[PDB]
Design a protein around this nucleic acid. Structure first.
Ligand SMILES: [Mg+2]
Lengths: 147, 165, 208
RNA sequence: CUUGAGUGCAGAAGAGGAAAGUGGAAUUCCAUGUGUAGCGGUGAAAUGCGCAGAGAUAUGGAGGAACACCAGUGGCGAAGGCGACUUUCUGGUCUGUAACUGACGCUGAUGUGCGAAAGCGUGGGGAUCAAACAGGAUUAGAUACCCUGGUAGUCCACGCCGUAAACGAUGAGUGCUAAGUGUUAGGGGGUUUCCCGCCCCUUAGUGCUGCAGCUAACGCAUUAAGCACUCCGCCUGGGGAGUACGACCGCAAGGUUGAAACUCAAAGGAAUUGACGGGGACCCGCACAAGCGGUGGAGCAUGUGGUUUAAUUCGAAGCAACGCGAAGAACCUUACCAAAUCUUGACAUCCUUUGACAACUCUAGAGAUAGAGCCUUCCCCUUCGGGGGACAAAGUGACAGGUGGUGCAUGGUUGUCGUCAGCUCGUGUCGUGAGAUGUUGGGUUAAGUCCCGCAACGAGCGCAACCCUUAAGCUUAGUUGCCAUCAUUAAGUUGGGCACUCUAAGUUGACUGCCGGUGACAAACCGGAGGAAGGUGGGGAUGACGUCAAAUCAUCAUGCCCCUUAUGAUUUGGGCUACACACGUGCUACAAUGGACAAUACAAAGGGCAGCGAAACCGCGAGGUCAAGCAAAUCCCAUAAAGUUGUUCUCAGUUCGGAUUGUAGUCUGCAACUCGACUACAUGAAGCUGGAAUCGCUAGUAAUCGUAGAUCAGCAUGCUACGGUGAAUACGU
């Protein structure tokens, strides 16, 4: 019921990478995600010269919801803070899930475009943020006086 | 209990049996039963009952509780002193003594009763309900509230043979 | 499921096999050698009412022993019988043997003997109940911690089949250190067939 | 004559009644001032009101009806009923008193009268609320609930009907029989300075808990359903039916009185158990949620249904049938069909009769078979017979056989409710009894697990353990296993070694068990250390009483019933595998985490004797020659694959996919035509993530890659186990 962490990963040195690779690992091939991600942190620095943590950390702030909803009952739905665990889980979850939805042929171009556009507050990740934060915290009036 | 004594003679005698059910989901658990009377046919009788999954168990258990409850049954001249009506739970009953030589005249259960308390000639008609149990409880209710000349004239300051049935 | 026999559960721990020999992977010659032994014994069982026979089998020989309550049936008066049985056995066994009778002790508390017995009274149309109450009763005199005793089928040679049981004492079953004597039987009178399922329990003990 | 009844005299209270009079809030309608765009309504909506300025807000006006608090199991009255206040008139009740008349009393048929609300007439009034009605919405539909309006009517007066769950479903009156406890109006007395306060008593109605007792039970219990008396009314199974005829009353609707015919064997009350509840309290579960991946689309395999058939062999059918029996369908199997065939028979036992047994060729035949050669040959024991395992062809009566029906006659066997946590028995008690009691309540658990408390005490089945396997260590043993010290070597292959790994045997350990807190001190919960492993450590096996008249007569066994010159038998060929279609199970696909080529590392488990197939050689290849080692820690199966590194590919129905078809070949089996498997060439399908609905799963899991085996002349995408890589989420109920 608690979380059972993943330790670090020292390529490039941080942990959010560690939580990231596992979601890309379609069908249990951990070396492929390992490669294409690590190269993604080569190319995102290559184009638009900067640090990997600048683009990455900044984006996964930019695409990271902090308020959010949930339904219960007629159709009412509580606006709800996000735990930091789910905070990053949603950031990365919707990040890759839309990073798919770009539609390039290349392993890493899609990602560098994704988080480097997100880090410019553009891309469907940011649009997802704005939609969730639209329906949420606009209809707060009815569902807020609860847990 | 009260005070079963296994010392007199005995003649167990059976009145009925039912097949009686308790339904639990799925099946139907049922438990044969029986009533009994037990007496010496010499001045003592009482009923006894019980239930079991099988007859011999039931009747035997009934007999173990049977001896435990008794009445003295004041009898006189191979006959009851007088006539009453018993009543218990709408199983009323009516007895009367008799010119001798008749034999007990009554229904099945009550016949088994008074035939076991050694009474010879007596008249009755059961009344109210025909259910076997409260019939009997009527009988022994009356016999429990019954007296003979010695039972009474003791109480009243006078004495028998200026007064007698 | 639903339930099973304990003997295939207790085996491996607290009972050896009724049959023993060398593997070499050639079983079928030797197991179906044993199979005819397992057949012919019925023509001793019918008179003897035996519990179980072992087959130990050394290299060049055979060594068995039949568990009975009735030795006199099979030993002959002064040995008149077992030699005869060796003769009628070698004709099909096609190899030597040292058939060596064994008696089983507290002799009639056993299972297949007694199951067979109650079947026997059901063969001559004994009512079912007294058989079972007297079974458990004599069993309890002879010493035991608990017995179960069952019948199935059309009782009293009557309408659609039923089954009952009159158990007494504790019959530890789902436990694993029991050493209970389970058996089974059959009997026909007129209507279908009647089996049983005897059980006992007589104290906890290992084979070592 | 006074004790019943009534009259007094002094008192107490009250929503007791009829008529008139007065007043505040509130709803509404209108008028005016203020001011803009919504109001109002619902679960969600709509219809309606509104720019002619609503609603909201303030002022004042009219108008009808009802009277917040007070109000209470409180009061009054004969009932129905009666709640703003004041006046007029006026009925009865309770107490105390006791002079006063001195039994005047109780009940009450027929009659007479009052009588909720609705209803009716005649006339007035009309603020709300609201049948009928209209519209809207829901709904399959809704003339019903919901919503917006809305007439009669509610209201007053004079009249009329004349009923109700008009109920406490309990007639009136009198009298006697345990208490406790409040409440309402009074009365007597003690205490108090004064009781106004406190207490004790007594009357009348009023409520609750309760015995004696009654009652079928629930229940009533001085306000009796107790103990009795008087008087009245009423019932005689249920439907038919409170109907019909008739009478009577009524303006009318309809009220009262009140049957029959036919028809049923029940109608019905009280309470117990069980199930159920869109009744309630509690907890748990891949049951929801949070998450991942799939079915459903596309093509293939397999099975059921259907269709069709000489036959497409039978069973199983909601979960709890449909990759099930069938863990192997060319024949065989195979039950089904066509053809030729048989009668103690395909086959088993018995009697006779013999005899040890048989084989190879020819003929005819598809075989089955026989038609002839030929030789099976008294072998174990014989003194001429005989005995015997074992043959014999013939007679052959008993016979034999039936995949022949009933699984709703059975045994046995197995699923399912569900590893759900419960279900039952004795003794004793209560109850007329069925049944209940324990097993309930508090606390507690994954657990009817456990403590405490309790008219209950104990036992059993069940969970747990008890056993296998797994996680660590110690001892023991060292080849085929291992090579750390070293030498040597293609190589642990051999010298040497058993240190480590390992192999299988014995034992240690994990048990609330140690500490701390909490908690009825207890059970138990929470946390701390230690250890490899803490709260059943992971898992397996194990499956209560019973249920589904669940499945199986086709594994087998079997009662009954049936077949017998065939419902039995042998054989060749055939089919069980059909094909407009749907259904379910599963496979591979719809490509860049991808495809093709090359190099390259890491397993576990299991099988091999008439079977594993090493090396080398040929061949593109399946395979072939050949033969070493191998009954196995030895040797072979047997490269593990995914992966990792490289080259290329750069988004196309593509080097995507891999169906179908033709050809050329490999092995097994006699023979691969229906119907085997396999390689090589060529072909190059549908399909570019899946609709409505829907399933799986909480960590070594899903997802995902390959390996071994059984069944086996050949044949497994299925079944079983084996490991490899290996995740996200679990807010919460
Ligand atoms: Mg009073």
């Amino acid at each position: 019921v608690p979380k059972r962490d993943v330790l670090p990963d020292p390529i490039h040195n941080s942990k959010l990478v560690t939580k990231l690779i596992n979601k890309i690992m379609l069908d249990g091939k951990r070396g492929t995600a390992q490669r294409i991600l690590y190269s993604a942190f080569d190319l995102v620095e290559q184009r638009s010269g900067r640090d990997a943590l600048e683009v990455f950390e900044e984006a996964i702030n930019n695409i990271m919801p902090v308020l959010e909803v949930k339904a219960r009952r007629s159709n009412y739905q509580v606006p709800v803070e996000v735990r930091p665990e789910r905070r990053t889980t949603l950031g990365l979850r919707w990040l890759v899930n839309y990073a798919r939805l770009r539609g390039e042929k290349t392993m890493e171009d899609r990602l560098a475009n994704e988080i480097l556009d997100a880090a410019n507050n553009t891309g469907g990740a940011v649009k997802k943020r704005e939609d969730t934060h639209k329906m949420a915290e606009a209809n707060k009036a009815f569902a807020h006086y609860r847990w | 209990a009260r005070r079963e004594e296994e010392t007199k003679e005995f003649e167990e005698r059976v009145v009925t049996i039912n097949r009686v059910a308790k339904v639990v989901k799925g099946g139907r658990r049922f438990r044969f039963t029986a009533l009994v009377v037990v007496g010496d046919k010499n001045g003592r009788v009482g009923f006894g009952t019980g239930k079991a999954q099988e007859v011999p168990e039931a009747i035997k258990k009934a007999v173990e509780a049977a001896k435990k409850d008794l009445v003295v049954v004041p009898r006189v001249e191979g006959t009851t002193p007088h006539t009453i009506t018993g009543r218990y739970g709408s199983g009323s009953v009516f007895m009367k003594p008799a010119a001798p030589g008749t034999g007990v005249i009554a229904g099945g259960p009550v016949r088994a009763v008074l035939e076991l308390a050694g009474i010879t000639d007596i008249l009755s008609k059961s009344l109210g309900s025909n259910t076997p149990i409260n019939m009997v409880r009527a009988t022994i209710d009356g016999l429990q509230n019954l007296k003979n000349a010695e039972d009474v004239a003791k109480l009243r300051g006078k004495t028998v043979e200026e007064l007698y049935n | 499921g639903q339930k099973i026999n304990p003997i295939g559960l207790r085996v491996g721990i607290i009972r050896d096999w009724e049959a023993k020999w060398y593997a070499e992977k050639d079983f079928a010659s030797l197991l179906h050698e044993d199979l005819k032994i397992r057949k012919f014994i019925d023509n001793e069982l019918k008179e003897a009412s035996v519990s179980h026979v072992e087959i130990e089998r050394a290299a060049n020989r055979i060594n068995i022993a039949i568990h009975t309550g009735k030795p006199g049936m099979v030993i002959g008066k002064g040995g008149s019988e077992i030699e005869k049985l060796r003769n009628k056995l070698n004709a099909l066994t096609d190899k030597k043997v040292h058939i060596n009778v064994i008696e089983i002790k507290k002799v009639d508390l056993d299972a297949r003997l007694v199951a067979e017995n109650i079947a026997r009274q059901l063969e001559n149309r004994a009512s079912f109940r007294r058989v079972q109450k007297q079974a458990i009763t004599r069993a309890m005199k002879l010493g035991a911690k608990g017995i179960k005793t069952q019948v199935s089928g059309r009782l009293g040679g009557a309408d659609i089949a039923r089954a009952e049981q009159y158990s007494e004492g504790t019959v530890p079953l789902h436990t694993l250190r029991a050493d209970i004597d389970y058996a089974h039987a059959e009997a026909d009178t007129t209507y279908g067939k009647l089996g049983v399922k005897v059980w006992i329990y007589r104290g906890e003990v290992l084979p070592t």
